[PDB]
Each structure stands twice: as C-alpha cells, then as structure tokens.
Amino acid sequence: EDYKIQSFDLETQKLLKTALKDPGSVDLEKVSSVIVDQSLKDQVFSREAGRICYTIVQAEAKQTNGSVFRRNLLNRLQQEFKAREETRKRSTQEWVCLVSFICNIFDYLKVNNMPMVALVHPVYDCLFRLAQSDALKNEEEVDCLVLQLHRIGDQLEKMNVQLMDELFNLLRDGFLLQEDLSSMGRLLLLEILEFRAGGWKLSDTAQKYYY
C-alpha cells in the first residue's frame, strides 16, 4: 500500500511494485541499483527503503526460493560504504543519507529473522565517524547520529556492548572536551546520554524538558 513510493519516477514506480510480488519477472540487478542510488539522494527514502528491501527478499525466498537480490543489494551497498570518506568530502547530505540508509537496512533486513552480523562493524564504523571532533560541529551530522541511536541503539548494544561503550565514551569526551560544539548539538547529545543511561528509554521528566 504505502511505502512513500512517490519519491521515484512514475515508470520506475512500475518496476518496483511488480518487483514486490514477482522477483522472477524483474531484473533484480536493476531493482537493487535503482534503490541504492536515489536513497543516497532523497533523505526521506533513507528511512523507508528498509521496509521495501526486506519484503523483496521475502518474495524471492518464496518465489525463487533464493536470494540473488540480496547479493546485489549488499554488494552495491558495501561499495558505497567503502567509499564513504570520499562521499563525506563531496557532501554532507549524501554522507548522512548513506548512514541513515545502512542503519535503516540493518533494522529491517534480516537473515532467518535475525539481524545480519555482517553490518554490525560497518554501522559502528559510521557512528564512530559521526562522533569525531570534526563531525560533531556539523549539526546535520549530529542530527543523524542521534536519530539512529534512537531506533537501533537497542539492538546494537545487544550485538556488541564494548563498541557501544566506546561510542558513548566518545560522546562523553565530545561533551567535556569540545571547545566549539553546536548549541543545539549540545542539546541532542545530553538527551541520548540520558536516553541510554535509562536503558534506551526517555524518562517522563526528560521528555518534558527536551520537547
């Protein structure tokens, strides 16, 4: 029904909808390549693509009893991941979009209904980059950091606690240490430092303050 599908070309919107039910009748190499590319660009799509990507792998399991689409999608995405530091120079919009998209994937795309181990260290690599002294300045990127930790921190800690410990050791440093930290960037950090400390819940009293 609704996937916020409009963002795309009207004839691409024809390829995808039919790729939802029938992966055998569509070129899955296109479908994967199509998704990755615009999602980098359209930030709204950087949060709705997960839903779509999963349901496709579910179909190909059902129809071809196989995943080929998943290979193309992961290969396509690992490429863009490796080339991230170049994309961070090229754009912040494009950088934040990619991170947003990788997390969105990790969250919905599952292997026998379990999170893909393959993406743990990648995702943590992104979040560590966003937690750097340079990135904490830019309040496009701090926006991004905390939007992820709001919806996937829970499972990431569960996957690996030491990394999460290090990440939050950086944020604590980035709060005491940093001479210039964005005014409302300072706000969004303290909020998660609490969020996590309360076991990935925002307390009622904290909910009033920040909202």
Binding site: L74, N75, V111, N112, M116, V117, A118
Partner: peptide, 19 residues
C-alpha cells in the same frame, strides 16, 4: 565474493539452517 558481506550473510543463513 571473497570477503563480501553478501558472502558473510549467506553463511550466517546457512549456519541457521543446520539444526
């Protein structure tokens, strides 16, 4: 793929399909 994620996911899947 030699070290590809898509390879590492296949193996996480195949692992789960073994009792």
């Amino acid at each position: 793929a030699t070290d590809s994620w898509a390879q590492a996911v296949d193996e996480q899947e195949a692992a789960a399909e073994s009792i």
